[PDB]
């Protein structure tokens, strides 16, 4: 089997991407944030504290003839950005782009933190990291990909995120028309439950490539590119007037600037992030100070190849017995 679904930016900055997901019988379609950095499929629901719902579409398990309460199971998750959610668990039928999993754990939110409430466009998350990170207790549950894998034509999914445009998540096949050149595969460590890999280096604009190992995670659920302070300083030094602002919480730059590209290495291959991808717009409405899309990972504890990086590539998440990651230009 295979599936193919369009993923759509939530706003004009590509702050996140939403993908429609069918849950239950009859189908209830919710727009979920597919997150290769976490491993819970959780939704706003009829059980979510009413004051914490503001415009989201909810899953109502009582209206699904295939929903079953997973007795005794609870979940609770906290994300790198400080947001969180928790609740109880149903199993139900879940379909993505024509690919159907029966008995998928659907984690129903009883509580969500303010940032989730405040984002009316995201109805929940669909985790695509390794199931070892799943938070369901006392019986850990499998991700949608993990459940689908054996049925797929090939045990893979691909992320093809657009810049200011829709893109695609495919399950079970590699669309050879969706990228240019070849796909370069690179080793993955699953030791921390992430799609963790080692970039071979970077360049800033038309500058020379610096060969250096940068361990980080391929994370579709993180907006920006978070890299070591040395790398980030080298990037922003090429932008007149750019500075790290403690009050804003990262590097800012004059909105009048033309940003240089940023290249990262995948083996001997190179992925080029155009400068415009690194512009996240005014820090506050009407400001001429703009927020940068490349930020320091210092104090995160891990480097993160988030959407800024991934959207410059066609990315293969290869879930074979020994997982690997593939990157192609597009």
């Amino acid at each position: 089997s295979t599936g193919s679904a369009t993923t759509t930016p939530i706003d004009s900055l590509d702050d996140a991407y939403i993908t429609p997901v069918q849950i239950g019988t009859p189908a209830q379609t919710l727009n979920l944030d597919f997150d290769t950095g976490s491993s819970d499929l959780w939704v706003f629901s009829s059980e979510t504290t009413a004051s914490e719902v503001d415009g989201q579409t909810i899953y109502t398990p009582s209206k699904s003839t295939t929903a079953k309460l997973l007795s005794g199971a609870t979940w609770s998750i906290s994300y790198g950005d400080g947001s969180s959610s928790s609740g109880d668990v149903y199993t139900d039928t879940v379909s993505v782009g024509g690919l159907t999993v029966t008995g998928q754990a659907v984690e129903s939110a009883k509580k969500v933190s303010s940032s989730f409430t405040e984002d009316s466009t995201i109805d929940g998350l669909l985790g695509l990291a390794f199931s070892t990170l799943n938070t369901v207790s006392p019986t850990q549950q499998k991700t949608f990909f993990d459940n689908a894998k054996a049925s797929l034509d090939s045990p893979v999914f691909t992320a093809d995120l657009g810049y200011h445009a829709p893109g695609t998540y495919n399950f079970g096949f590699i669309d050879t028309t969706a990228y240019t050149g070849s796909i370069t595969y690179t080793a993955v460590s699953t030791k921390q439950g992430f799609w963790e890999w080692t970039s071979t280096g970077y360049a800033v604009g038309s500058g020379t490539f610096k060969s250096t190992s940068i361990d980080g995670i391929a994370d579709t659920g993180t907006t920006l590119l978070y890299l070591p302070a040395t790398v980030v300083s080298a990037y922003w030094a090429q932008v007149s007037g750019a500075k790290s602002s403690s009050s804003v919480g990262g590097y800012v730059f004059p909105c009048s600037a033309t940003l240089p590209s940023f290249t990262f290495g995948v083996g001997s291959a190179r992925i080029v992030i155009p400068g415009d991808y690194i512009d996240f717009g005014p820090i506050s409405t009407g400001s001429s100070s703009c927020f940068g899309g490349i930020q320091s990972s210092a104090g995160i504890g891990i480097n993160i190849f988030g959407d800024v990086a991934l959207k410059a590539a066609f990315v293969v998440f290869n879930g074979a017995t020994t997982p690997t990651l593939g990157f192609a230009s597009k």
Side-chain angles (χ1 to χ4, degrees), residues 163 235-236 253 259-262 273-281 291-294 308 311:
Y163 167 68
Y235 179 80
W236 291 107
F253 69 92
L259 296 177
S261 65
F262 184 92
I273 304 172
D276 292 348
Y277 289 26
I278 297 160
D279 177 14
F280 280 74
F291 197 68
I294 296 178
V308 163
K311 75 190 181 191

Side-chain angles (χ1 to χ4, degrees), residues 12-31:
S12 65
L13 298 175
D14 298 348
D15 281 318
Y17 298 78
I18 50 172
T19 309
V21 178
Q22 282 70 50
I23 310 175
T25 310
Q28 301 179 39
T29 299
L30 274 65
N31 295 328

Side-chain angles (χ1 to χ4, degrees), residues 21-62 64-67 69-109 112-141 143-148 150-190 192-242 244-304:
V21 178
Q22 282 70 50
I23 310 175
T25 310
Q28 301 179 39
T29 299
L30 274 65
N31 295 328
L32 303 190
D33 185 350
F34 282 24
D35 180 14
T36 62
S38 70
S39 305
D40 287 50
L41 192 176
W42 75 260
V43 296
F44 278 80
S45 77
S46 56
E47 301 178 327
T48 311
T49 299
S51 60
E52 296 180 351
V53 183
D54 187 5
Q56 296 81 10
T57 295
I58 64 169
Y59 169 58
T60 304
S62 68
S64 174
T65 57
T66 41
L69 180 68
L70 187 61
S71 183
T74 58
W75 62 279
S76 180
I77 194 163
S78 304
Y79 297 102
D81 67 354
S83 70
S84 63
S85 53
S86 62
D88 53 20
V89 188
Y90 293 80
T91 56
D92 209 339
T93 301
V94 173
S95 300
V96 176
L99 171 64
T100 300
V101 167
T102 58
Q104 174 64 45
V106 177
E107 302 173 34
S108 168
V112 304
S113 66
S114 60
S115 61
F116 286 115
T117 299
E118 288 160 3
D119 184 2
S120 70
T121 73
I122 290 175
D123 303 323
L125 268 63
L126 190 149
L128 293 166
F130 293 87
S131 293
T132 53
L133 295 180
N134 175 266
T135 77
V136 177
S137 179
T139 307
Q140 186 172 67
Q141 301 294 303
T143 70
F144 175 82
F145 179 54
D146 208 337
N147 281 323
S151 300
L152 296 177
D153 289 359
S154 179
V156 306
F157 68 91
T158 65
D160 179 10
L161 303 179
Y163 167 68
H164 292 356
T168 305
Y169 282 102
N170 291 330
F171 292 82
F173 72 105
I174 287 161
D175 178 357
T176 62
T177 71
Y179 58 87
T180 62
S182 299
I183 304 176
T184 295
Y185 290 85
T186 197
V188 164
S189 172
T190 65
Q192 295 190 78
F194 300 124
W195 292 91
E196 189 172 359
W197 65 290
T198 301
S199 172
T200 47
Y202 70 97
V204 175
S206 60
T208 61
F209 188 83
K210 176 71 170 183
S211 293
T212 185
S213 296
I214 305 173
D215 298 339
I217 65 168
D219 185 1
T220 59
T222 290
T223 312
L224 306 185
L225 174 52
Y226 294 88
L227 292 173
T230 46
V231 178
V232 175
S233 181
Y235 179 80
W236 291 107
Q238 298 304 309
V239 181
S240 298
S244 184
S245 168
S246 54
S247 58
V248 175
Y251 280 89
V252 298
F253 69 92
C255 292
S256 62
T258 299
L259 296 177
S261 65
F262 184 92
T263 299
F264 65 93
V266 182
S268 59
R270 306 288 179 254
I271 300 293
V272 180
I273 304 172
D276 292 348
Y277 289 26
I278 297 160
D279 177 14
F280 280 74
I283 60 173
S284 291
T285 304
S287 179
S288 70
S289 182
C290 272
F291 197 68
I294 296 178
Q295 297 293 347
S296 180
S297 64
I300 294 177
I302 199 160
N303 301 305
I304 307 174

